[PDB]
Write an enzyme that holds these catalytic residues in place. Structure first.
Site, PDB file in Angstrom:
ATOM      1  N   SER A 136       5.061  -6.028  -2.065  1.00 39.04           N
ATOM      2  CA  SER A 136       5.473  -4.622  -2.118  1.00 39.04           C
ATOM      3  C   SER A 136       5.967  -4.131  -0.751  1.00 39.04           C
ATOM      4  O   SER A 136       6.884  -4.735  -0.204  1.00 39.04           O
ATOM      5  CB  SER A 136       4.353  -3.752  -2.706  1.00 39.04           C
ATOM      6  OG  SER A 136       3.920  -4.266  -3.949  1.00 39.04           O
ATOM      7  N   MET A 137       5.373  -3.076  -0.184  1.00 39.87           N
ATOM      8  CA  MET A 137       5.719  -2.639   1.175  1.00 39.87           C
ATOM      9  C   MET A 137       5.524  -3.716   2.246  1.00 39.87           C
ATOM     10  O   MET A 137       6.181  -3.671   3.284  1.00 39.87           O
ATOM     11  CB  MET A 137       4.929  -1.382   1.573  1.00 39.87           C
ATOM     12  CG  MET A 137       5.413  -0.104   0.916  1.00 39.87           C
ATOM     13  SD  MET A 137       7.176   0.225   1.133  1.00 39.87           S
ATOM     14  CE  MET A 137       7.327   0.565   2.878  1.00 39.87           C
ATOM     15  N   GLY A 190       0.826  -1.216   0.000  1.00 43.22           N
ATOM     16  CA  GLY A 190       0.000   0.000   0.000  1.00 43.22           C
ATOM     17  C   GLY A 190       0.853   1.256   0.000  1.00 43.22           C
ATOM     18  O   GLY A 190       1.803   1.353  -0.772  1.00 43.22           O
ATOM     19  N   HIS A 221       8.397  -5.467  -5.949  1.00 41.66           N
ATOM     20  CA  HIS A 221       8.330  -4.632  -7.149  1.00 41.66           C
ATOM     21  C   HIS A 221       8.666  -3.171  -6.833  1.00 41.66           C
ATOM     22  O   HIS A 221       8.876  -2.811  -5.673  1.00 41.66           O
ATOM     23  CB  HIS A 221       6.981  -4.794  -7.894  1.00 41.66           C
ATOM     24  CG  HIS A 221       5.792  -4.118  -7.259  1.00 41.66           C
ATOM     25  ND1 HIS A 221       4.506  -4.347  -7.704  1.00 41.66           N
ATOM     26  CD2 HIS A 221       5.678  -3.220  -6.249  1.00 41.66           C
ATOM     27  CE1 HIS A 221       3.655  -3.627  -6.995  1.00 41.66           C
ATOM     28  NE2 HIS A 221       4.341  -2.930  -6.109  1.00 41.66           N
TER      29      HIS A 221
END
Ligand SMILES: [N-]=[N+]=NCCC[C@H]1C(=O)N(Cc2cccc3ccccc23)C[C@@H]2N(C(=O)NCCCC(F)(F)F)CCC(=O)N21
Ligand SMILES: [N-]=[N+]=NCCC[C@H]1C(=O)N(Cc2cccc3ccccc23)C[C@@H]2N(C(=O)NCCCC(F)(F)F)CCC(=O)N21
Ligand SMILES: [N-]=[N+]=NCCC[C@H]1C(=O)N(Cc2cccc3ccccc23)C[C@@H]2N(C(=O)NCCCC(F)(F)F)CCC(=O)N21
Ligand SMILES: [N-]=[N+]=NCCC[C@H]1C(=O)N(Cc2cccc3ccccc23)C[C@@H]2N(C(=O)NCCCC(F)(F)F)CCC(=O)N21
Ligand SMILES: [N-]=[N+]=NCCC[C@H]1C(=O)N(Cc2cccc3ccccc23)C[C@@H]2N(C(=O)NCCCC(F)(F)F)CCC(=O)N21
Ligand SMILES: [N-]=[N+]=NCCC[C@H]1C(=O)N(Cc2cccc3ccccc23)C[C@@H]2N(C(=O)NCCCC(F)(F)F)CCC(=O)N21
Ligand SMILES: [N-]=[N+]=NCCC[C@H]1C(=O)N(Cc2cccc3ccccc23)C[C@@H]2N(C(=O)NCCCC(F)(F)F)CCC(=O)N21
Ligand SMILES: [N-]=[N+]=NCCC[C@H]1C(=O)N(Cc2cccc3ccccc23)C[C@@H]2N(C(=O)NCCCC(F)(F)F)CCC(=O)N21
Ligand SMILES: [N-]=[N+]=NCCC[C@H]1C(=O)N(Cc2cccc3ccccc23)C[C@@H]2N(C(=O)NCCCC(F)(F)F)CCC(=O)N21
Lengths: 186, 186, 187, 185, 185, 184, 182, 187, 190
Positions: F89-90, F60, F114
């Protein structure tokens, strides 16, 4: 999410315990009914001690604003008014409606005065009734502002013809408030 | 967010109900009428003698819902005082006028408005007729009771409610919709 | 929205249920009928002798939900009084008329309305026929019970319900939908 | 896409050359104005020869229908009416409005009659005016239908209270049309 | 769903240790809550520090000044701690913390820009709205100048468009006093 | 409807009593603020004992993620990270941010890395500023991942250019986690 | 819209015999068209009668006055014929036809009322809009008094609410001259 | 549906253009301005001496589109008469006033309205300032030209356009927006 | 509804729509937002007029708020490619790529009528997705701006760096101001 403070109070209910009422949103009938009931309750607790009305409001309904106005004047205690953030339209009206010598604003607060807003659609006679009504309402508001501020009714009408933004210090010298509440400790 | 007062913990409107103050503070639909009818009956059962205080800040709404409140006021033994704060329009002003004789109030800047009932109908001519006859009867019934309550003639009520008719608190007293304009004594 | 009462802490409607008063104060759907049925059964279990009071301020609604209330009223031992305040229309007035004989009331400015049931159907001719026959049987069933409860004949009920028929509290009494207009005695 | 026939005419305009006017849709003002214009045009070409009003319509506006009705009655030529497919509400009112002895339906054509539809919102006095207006309009319709069909105003009012579908034959014996135009063998 | 501790919700537990959470877009609801909390903590203890957590993208200018003025009015020092981001009125409030006690954590983002607004209607109404927002900008810039040590015109150039700063860059700018280092294990 | 267990606790608050924090959703500011507050509370409860960060998240907001990251590195207690379900991701950045030797994934857990996503609309100069900002943010994320995984910045850059899914075992050999937590 | 045979659409064919069709709600587009037609028919022949067909629920007041002023400006008599309905500005325009040449067919509906409008914003903006539509009403009622023979105070009472009239009632009111019987 | 006329088959507006009449019968936008500009240029080329007639029934609209028409009127050799029929509001009434001096007309019941220009701006304080300064300059420009065209002072124009100001045809004449009210021949 | 004009010939009546009649006299109308449809039409019109006469002037009427940069460059390059001088006249407004095309007319034959408005600003765009996709779009629109500014500098005589500052925000110019800036050569007076 409104935080809780410890009996256990939500933060606004805790403020009401020390006679502080929060006018913190647009003025509609729900907000008015709540502020009326709080004023009545605080009267019954103590008719002598001051009530404190916090005002951070863009205004709203004139009639709902007058429910609060009248209830302030009716009750025995002085109702201090403190503008924090902004007091616009009926917000600034109620700010000027506080007990004499006890109407305040903090240094960077924004006071705004204008004429009432409304509408009408349908037949020419219906438009006429709505136009006559809102014009009487404006004069009613301008009358009370003139009495509260010490400016003439004609000066109030010119200055409220369009949106008129005033600083805290400007609202004092206009007569909407009595004092700019400065940070003493700083 | 309705604040809470501790004196046992009450929400502010329930604390007011403890001292026999009912709040008619929104549009009159069936839900508001049922809540008020229940409050009325309850306050009778607590004490059949002591006064009830009906606060009115409302633009009216449903006529049948309004009549649920009217009939329940008249049925019970206690006097129901009516207090216009903010505004009382359409069925709101009717219920203002239905307060116990000598105890119908309005605060100085409160707004009172009377008009004829509003409705609608779509479909076959026979259905339009039935709806038209119904709303006319409903207006006759409202005008009958307003005449009895105010002292004005039925013919004057029908003329004066033909279109929206705004009244000050003082004009409402002269008309017979309230008995007194509750002035700021202190 | 709903005020609380300290007389143990009740919401106002729950305080009325403690004194055997049930509020039918809205459009009749299944959620409303289940609540009212559950209230009627509870009050029976507390006391099978004492009266129950059904407050009716309702525009009607689902016929089957109305019959859920009706059958639960007739099934239980206690007399269930019905009091129309505000309005009782369509299935609201049917349920007003279903109260225990001699205990169906209306306040003077209450409005009563009777009509035939409302429905719908869309699709094949055969599906439209099934839906039409079903709603017609439902109307006959409603009219048969209204005849028995009021004392009017089935054919008089069918003419008087063909379109929206508005009645005063007094006109409702002389029709046989209520027994007494509950006038204000203290005034 | 409306096909063309050959001097080139679109198919409806070719029918207009032989004095046939097509009332083939819901009756709104635009349809009424066009048919009124067509009737006035055909009168000017020949005040004697019959005009043929094809009616396949579910009705529509009462005032727009009376624009067509009054223009039919005003002009000199007999206006034949032919119900093909359906004629409902003001459509069936216009079917009955044709020249006497020249109102027709084809055998499987549907005829429906009912009372006018409308609406009103606002004050009780505004509702009252709309109710009185539409009730007068229904009396006006039923009075003219009575004259055209031979049925009493009271029978028309009972028979138009709710949707009342009629076969071609039923519409003949009701007096809405004069003949069922049967197919030759 | 906010977790509970033993019975406080987690934010109310933080408020018990004089930590206030500014973790959303600044509107009037958020401002009124923080103002109420600041006034309450003063009443409990007028000497002890308050800790204002800032993870905010900014929002209403007047709502921000409600918070700003209340911070300045009360006796206790209000520490400011940027975690995540402080943008627009968020970064203004970050700079408004007690001198020596304005912090950001090492990877926190600080953004400064000029205020955003709008106006529709007559030229005179557009003029009034334009003069109002420009005065508001000058007021914001004057206070930022005082708080940071930078000139008003340097603030004006640097806030003309979005200007992203690291925690370290914010420190040398004067928006914060220190990049908060990890606690001693 | 979250179930209750008996002092009465909702199930997540019960887990919080034993120093377990749930990062079980998309990372926005609200989630971050909650987790930050929980980390600070658990520190005050005990400065020595381990904290357990459950991660089942698609990622997010980057700034919201860095609020959680910085707070983890700030506090005294070691924060264990445990990827169950997914960390994308995060989410995977925060997985890698756990205390050294105590970053875990369960065997069928999905890890994805990513580059950051964003946008811009308006004038060329506004687009340039938004472009410079997100590129610096990527450099910031890649520098920290390099430190946390032992991989070079240029390898992180290549491997995060497009969506790069990793098995739990693959995450370990990359350096995002230390161990695949086997069934006991 | 059908064609007749050079080739004309049916409305253009009617314009060839000096007939203008007001068959819709009156907006600026309808008014510009009718004003242009009136001007064209004047230029062709300044003496021959023009025939204005009216089947209209009314519409814009200013657009109606574009048609009204142009009718009064040109030399030819403009006959007005109500077929179907003439309501509000439609009925105003019906009454504006040449004296002795305003007609309606037997079942045609004529309605008169006061103008409609609206206003929103400041009290000063509402006042201006109120005074404007009140002036517009006095102007409309003045002209109707002149065109019908009724007093201004009678026109104001009868147009207070929607007032529906038969063709025969429109004649004896003075809105038309003759009911055109078949 | 616009009616067709045959003498050469013209639509009715195109027939009017043959006799040098241009129709400004709608809200002023770029399309309308481009069409009117082109007609003016075409009519000049046909005959540089004969009058052109601009029909105005318009609520106004874009100021720049209105100035496209204003400048093209002033550029060409032929006098451009202006005739307000129905209404001329805002930029409509500006263009009415821009007709050849001595040849600006209104019919008796035509509504003429003058106010200040309308606009809007969203975004940064700097962007709001630029949009405010632009529309204020635009109002000064409009007011300066109105002064030159009517004979009224700039400060009077300023006060009379501050709010919506409705004028009758006659009031427009004595204000100086038009030269004559075109009265009808008797009866 | 675009009006049509009919002129009498020896062999009947010739009917043109008004814009097509203007094209007969070598007048091209740029009267709307510049999209690809507008560009292709204008391009085709220029090419046609060259083929009819390679020596006679063409007149480009500009009343346009601008639009697509690439569409504008279709027009721009086609003007520069053809042999005939293309006069530009601003009537109403010329904004953004509109004012760029105004500036691109033949040297000495760029005009505006006295009350016409001329505005210049930097190009507008957008980008969403991955950081690398944002970089590419950012670099692309920045190069496009340099390209616009460089040609404006050549056409106006203003330096690239002054063009960049003057176009940073919306810059409104009167017709006279546009002349003195070098966007036009003459204010065509009545
Ligand atoms: N001149 N003079 N004056 C004094 C008469 C006041 C009078 C009355 O008219 N009302 C009506 C009322 C309703 C709602 C809001 C109002 C706001 C402003 C004025 C009136 C209001 C209520 C009040 N009561 C009361 O305060 N009881 C204490 C309890 C208050 C609580 F704690 F519940 F808030 C009950 C006893 C009583 O006689 N009155
Ligand atoms: N005057 N008079 N009287 C005649 C007694 C009225 C009679 C009755 O008809 N109802 C029906 C009813 C329902 C709802 C709203 C009404 C409003 C107006 C009239 C009637 C209403 C209820 C009431 N009861 C009661 O009040 N019990 C006390 C508890 C009240 C509570 F606290 F629950 F509100 C139970 C005992 C009983 O026989 N009655
Ligand atoms: N033949 N026969 N008949 C009379 C015995 C009724 C019988 C039964 O059929 N039901 C089914 C039932 C369910 C729900 C709503 C109903 C409404 C109307 C009729 C039936 C209903 C439940 C009931 N019980 C009960 O009332 N217990 C008292 C507790 C009630 C509470 F307080 F919980 F509400 C449990 C014991 C039992 O045998 N019965
Ligand atoms: N019985 N009879 N009456 C004919 C005399 C009636 C009279 C008239 O009142 N009108 C008005 C009118 C307009 C529109 C539709 C109407 C429908 C029904 C009645 C009237 C209508 C027009 C008609 N004209 C005509 O038909 N000219 C022929 C050409 C017609 C065309 F071919 F164009 F359609 C012009 C000459 C004239 O004096 N009149
Ligand atoms: N230095 N100095 N000066 C000035 C004394 C402050 C003064 C006052 O002006 N207000 C008004 C006020 C309202 C709302 C928000 C405000 C924010 C900023 C400033 C003022 C505010 C209320 C305050 N009270 C109080 O704090 N009581 C303690 C309880 C606080 C609680 F716990 F409820 F939060 C009641 C007693 C009193 O005289 N005051
Ligand atoms: N004591 N100490 N020490 C360590 C000094 C930290 C310092 C500080 O900078 N903050 C600001 C802060 C706010 C929000 C989130 C943060 C996350 C990371 C870092 C800082 C944060 C608050 C903290 N307090 C505290 O933890 N109190 C313990 C209770 C915590 C609770 F249980 F309430 F969550 C109050 C006392 C104090 O000086 N501080
Ligand atoms: N008595 N009198 N009247 C009318 C001659 C007045 C005068 C004028 O003021 N106008 C302006 C005008 C425009 C639009 C609609 C209007 C409606 C009502 C009044 C005026 C109108 C045009 C007209 N022309 C004309 O009619 N030419 C004939 C051709 C007409 C065509 F066939 F093209 F429609 C050109 C020659 C001329 O000097 N005038
Ligand atoms: N002295 N001096 N000045 C100035 C010479 C005018 C000059 C010019 O600048 N333009 C550009 C132009 C375009 C569009 C609208 C405009 C409006 C107002 C002014 C200019 C306009 C076109 C014009 N032409 C012409 O009119 N030809 C006649 C035919 C016109 C048609 F019939 F096609 F409409 C072609 C020949 C020519 O040199 N010019
Ligand atoms: N300087 N220079 N020169 C023109 C010779 C260039 C060359 C060519 O490259 N094109 C490609 C082309 C397509 C579309 C738009 C273009 C815009 C700008 C440049 C090129 C364009 C077409 C052109 N032709 C031509 O013009 N024929 C005349 C007819 C034109 C018509 F009337 F159809 F529009 C056919 C013969 C030929 O070899 N060429």
């Amino acid at each position: 999410l409104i935080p809780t403070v410890i009996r256990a109070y939500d933060i606004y209910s805790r403020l009401l315990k020390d006679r502080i009422i929060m006018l913190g949103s647009q003025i509609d009938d729900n907000v008015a009914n709540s502020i009326v009931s709080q004023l009545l309750f605080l009267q019954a607790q103590d008719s002598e001690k001051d009530i404190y009305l916090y005002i951070n409001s863009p205004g709203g309904s004139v009639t709902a604003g007058f429910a609060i106005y009248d209830t302030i004047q009716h009750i025995k205690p002085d109702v201090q008014t403190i503008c924090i953030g902004m007091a616009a339209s009926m917000g600034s009206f109620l700010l000027a409606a506080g007990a004499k010598g006890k109407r305040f604003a903090l240094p960077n607060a924004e006071v705004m005065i204008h004429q009432p807003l409304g509408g009408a659609q349908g037949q020419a006679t219906e438009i006429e009734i709505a136009a006559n009504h809102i014009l009487k309402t404006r004069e009613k508001l301008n009358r009370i502002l003139s009495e509260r501020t010490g400016q003439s009714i004609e000066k109030i009408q010119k200055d409220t013809d369009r949106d008129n933004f005033l600083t805290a210090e400007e609202a004092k010298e206009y007569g909407l408030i009595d004092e700019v509440m400065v940070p003493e400790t700083k």
